[PDB]
């Protein structure tokens, strides 16, 4: 079974598909991170493209854009205005990906077209927790006997939790030999995490990243990535404390 990202926009139809096993379980689809506690909180120097350069296919704020080079997105005030290609997170310029049911990892993501190297896939959106809120969620999810975990360290005191609210990025599985990576980008002075391919991903291939998982649980989940260099377990050999996993 597989589904497209537009299938997640209709909660009633999705909930019915989920009951038949044709879609993953329902969660709250969000367009950007939601902070449980709000925290205290830049033009590039690109020369604007002329209309002829735009017509000829020149890229606005491409590889030489100072903001892009520092993993900062441009705002609406960019010298290239509407044409700026460095607003991918804000404009939801996602890769063409489908959500698929895997043999033993749960649901996952696959490329629906060939994806060039260094292509933005999706932003890892969720609820952003502080350390107190994180520990509360650790206990809740352990009490609920959850199998899948969706915590991602954003900063030392910001953990993204995509368990209850997020987007289809929450389906990207771990691989010990991955084809994607996280990148931390600044958008409106705030940090976000996106997934980007690290190589050409052929159409139909599962998209994976290396979680570098910090396991606090007593038991480690076996890794089913299938790589010749598989580490055997999500989290590797060592168990860490809850405090260490949460970034101190």
């Amino acid at each position: 079974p597989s589904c497209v990202m537009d299938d997640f926009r209709d909660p009633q139809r999705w909930k019915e598909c989920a009951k038949q096993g044709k879609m993953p379980c329902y969660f709250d689809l969000i367009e950007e991170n939601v902070y449980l506690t709000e925290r205290k909180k830049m033009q590039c120097e690109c020369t604007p493209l002329s209309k002829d350069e735009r017509a000829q296919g020149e890229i606005a704020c491409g590889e030489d854009c100072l903001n892009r080079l520092l993993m900062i997105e441009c705002s609406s005030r960019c010298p290239n205005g509407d044409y700026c290609s460095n607003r991918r997170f804000q404009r939801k310029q996602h890769a063409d990906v489908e959500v698929i049911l895997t043999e033993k990892k749960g649901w996952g993501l696959r490329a629906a077209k060939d994806l060039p190297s260094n292509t933005f896939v999706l932003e890892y959106c969720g609820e952003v927790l502080d350390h107190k809120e994180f520990k509360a969620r650790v206990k809740e999810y352990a009490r609920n006997k959850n199998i899948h975990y969706y915590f991602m360290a954003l900063k030392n005191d910001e953990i993204i939790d995509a368990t209850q609210k997020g987007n289809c990025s929450r389906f990207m599985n771990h691989s010990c030999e991955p084809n994607c990576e996280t990148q931390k980008w600044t958008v409106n002075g705030q940090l976000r995490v996106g997934f980007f391919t690290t190589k050409l991903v052929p159409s139909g291939s599962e998209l994976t990243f290396d979680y570098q998982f910090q396991r606090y649980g007593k038991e480690a989940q076996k890794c089913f990535c299938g790589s010749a260099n598989c580490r055997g377990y999500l989290g590797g050999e060592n168990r860490v404390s809850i405090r260490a996993a949460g970034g101190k």
Binding site: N146, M152, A153, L154, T182, D210, R215, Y216, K218, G247
Partner: peptide
Amino acid sequence: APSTGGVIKPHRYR
């Protein structure tokens, strides 16, 4: 001491 759980750590692929 939870049975399962942990935190994903972003890093640049090398």
